[PDB]
Paper text:
Here, we report cryo-EM structures of human H1-containing tetranucleosome arrays with four physiologically relevant NRLs. The structures show a zig-zag arrangement of nucleosomes, with nucleosomes 1 and 3 forming a stack. H1 binding to stacked nucleosomes depends on the NRL, whereas H1 always binds to the non-stacked nucleosomes 2 and 4. H1 contacts DNA with L1, the amino-terminal part of α2 together with L3, and α3 to stabilize the nucleosome and contribute to chromatin compaction.
We were nevertheless able to refine the structure of nucleosome 4 as part of a tetranucleosome in the 4×177 array and also in isolation within the 4×187 array. The linker DNA connecting nucleosomes 3 and 4 was always visible and always showed the same trajectory as in the 4×177 structure. H1 is absent from the stacked nucleosomes of the 4×177 array, but is present on nucleosome 1 in the 4×187 and 4×197 arrays, and is present on both stacked nucleosomes in the 4×207 array. Furthermore, exit DNA of nucleosome 1 shows the highest Δβ value for the 4×177 array, which is the only array in which H1 is lacking on this nucleosome. We now report structures that show that short NRLs impair H1 binding to stacked nucleosomes and suggest this is due to altered linker DNA trajectories. Altered linker DNA trajectories, as observed in our 4×177 array, sterically preclude H1-linker DNA contacts that are required for stable H1 binding. To confirm that our observations are not a result of low salt concentrations, we solved the trinucleosome core structure of the H1-bound 4×177 array at 60 mM NaCl and confirmed the presence of nucleosome stacks and the absence of H1 on stacking nucleosomes.
Residue numbers in the entry:
A (entry chain m), B (entry chain q): 10 to 118
C (entry chain l), D (entry chain p): 20 to 102
E (entry chain k), F (entry chain o): 37 to 133
G (entry chain n), H (entry chain r): 30 to 124
Write the structure that this text describes.
Amino acid sequence: ARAKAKTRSSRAGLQFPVGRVHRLLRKGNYSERVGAGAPVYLAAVLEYLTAEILELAGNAARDNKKTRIIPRHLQLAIRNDEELNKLLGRVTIAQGGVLPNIQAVLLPK
Amino acid sequence: ARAKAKTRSSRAGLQFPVGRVHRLLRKGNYSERVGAGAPVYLAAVLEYLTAEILELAGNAARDNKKTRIIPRHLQLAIRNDEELNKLLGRVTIAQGGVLPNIQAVLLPK
Amino acid sequence: KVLRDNIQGITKPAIRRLARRGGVKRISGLIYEETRGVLKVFLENVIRDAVTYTEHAKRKTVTAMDVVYALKRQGRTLYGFGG
Amino acid sequence: KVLRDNIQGITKPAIRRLARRGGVKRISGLIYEETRGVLKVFLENVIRDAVTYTEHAKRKTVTAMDVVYALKRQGRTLYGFGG
Amino acid sequence: KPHRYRPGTVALREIRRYQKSTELLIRKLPFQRLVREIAQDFKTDLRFQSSAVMALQEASEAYLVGLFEDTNLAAIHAKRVTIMPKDIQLARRIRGE
Amino acid sequence: KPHRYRPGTVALREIRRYQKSTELLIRKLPFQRLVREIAQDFKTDLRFQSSAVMALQEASEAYLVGLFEDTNLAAIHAKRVTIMPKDIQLARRIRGE
Amino acid sequence: KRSRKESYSVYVYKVLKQVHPDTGISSKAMGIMNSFVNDIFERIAGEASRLAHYNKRSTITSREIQTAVRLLLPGELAKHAVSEGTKAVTKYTSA
Amino acid sequence: KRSRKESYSVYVYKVLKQVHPDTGISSKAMGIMNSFVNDIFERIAGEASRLAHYNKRSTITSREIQTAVRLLLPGELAKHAVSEGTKAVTKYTSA
């Protein structure tokens, strides 16, 4: 006699699993009680940052004519964006390289 | 009828309230259970560090010939211990001042 | 009430006192305004987050424990203010 | 069984390759051994806590997840090795 | 003649004096006024615990004198005794700000 | 006359090439030799994920690269182009190390 | 067989096809993404944990999370994230 | 009616009299000491919570703190703290 079970992700119309992340919050030893809308909100903003970084990385990969994302364009996306770079200044990337940065004083006459 | 109330700090021979420590752990929600020797070990290593830093503060205060220790004595105690400076480099101290440090390049001749 | 020009509420001789405490011997005239900008950036950051605290605390007065939070979230940790 | 000299396996072409990727143009001859010592210091700083991890994880095999912890408690956060 | 100490003697004396002393150097009232001014940029109707204000003053002064010592050693490396803000910008950027 | 480039230009091309490229620049087998050399000094007979060593490498030369841009900034800021160890010492102090 | 290992690769790949229907992914980049999202998840949840400590509150609400978003995010990221999460919260409230 | 607030300054004072019976202290210095206690407490507690979260541990014992302090403490301090806490926990265990 139970109604059809929607997902809370479908109730928010979103991609990320609300049950998984809410379970992570409950077993994270963070609080005994967690409100209903907070994991939904967290999944939404994780979706926002994910789409933002992924879109910029896809644009950067399109700049160098490859349709499969590599850590180099991940580094290019994260370091050329001052909010993203400031957000992750203490963050290391594997095989992302660095931004090509040449001092003009090193350049010859 | 019931045994004498005997403190766990006295049982561990300690000074810091291990019951208060364990309670703050439980309200700190670090785990859903905590073993008995954990807050004892916490308390004990806190008297160890406290004894070391207060030893240093006493050395500074007898060097600074004042009976009651002050935050300047605290600063002078801690900042000539470079091991603490790895431990507490990112720590600022209220009214502690700075180490008197004048470089030889500032000195004439 | 309404305040405008506390950018120069830091006097230059105060900066020279700090620089002698900072071990500086010879100070350019260009130093003070650049340091003013730097300190403005730092206080805008920490006081913005302090305001975020106090509105989250639903208060119209700030506390020093909010300041403790503001110093700790980059690890500029200060002792003796209710911590 | 023991290991005695692999720090001189750090080739100065590799050091200058990192210098070029680090943007260094002209390099003194005395640089190499000092940078070797500095990076070696960094290595004990990481691997000491990594050894402590593997000991507390009750293993004799070093895994990348402990490496993630060992980099991250100094805030050297590396992505792609956690999981 | 009336006496005049040669440059650097007096400056080093005040360096010794203020490395000896611990207290705040900027006047507290204009700093407080600046605190109120900056906090007004975010939200009106705000009161201020004084303990918060002295905490801000001490933390700010410690931050400043730390970067002062940093730029000091940087100018020592740069073979100079006169500090210029290019040293400050280099110290911030390498420090990460 | 045989072809020979003036100094620095090939180094500039190396800088450009390596700033595009992301691969490891040390031969890795001496790097695991160093890893096991240092590891046995804390506990002997520890085994290693190869991925663990690769993470150690990526973090290691990443830290060295960032140190190298800081060292280059120090070398320029003292009105030069050639690095000396005093750049490294100043960088280590200003990084809090 | 082996135990199930949960991954965001399906969900992030869905988001990928939302924003870039054209491009593929590498497994290394996806491990970078998972390490990323788990890192920032425990970040934001940690500051929310300290907020729960400072507010002496047992139950975590969205309000505390939006506050922690102003703590973490740089600027227009924070305002846009607040906006998007606000709309998502509204349609979740109306299910 | 005032709300009783827990502070360690009495414990700091008795520790001081243990190490130096002749020595006094200011109130702001005791505030610094209590801040130090709380600071090291929250550091070690968060670190132990994370180490429990890694090895799927739900019960914290002194072994985990011993590991976490020998992480956080370099040099001889780690060895001496491990030794002293070992004696304290051991004779507590006999008690």
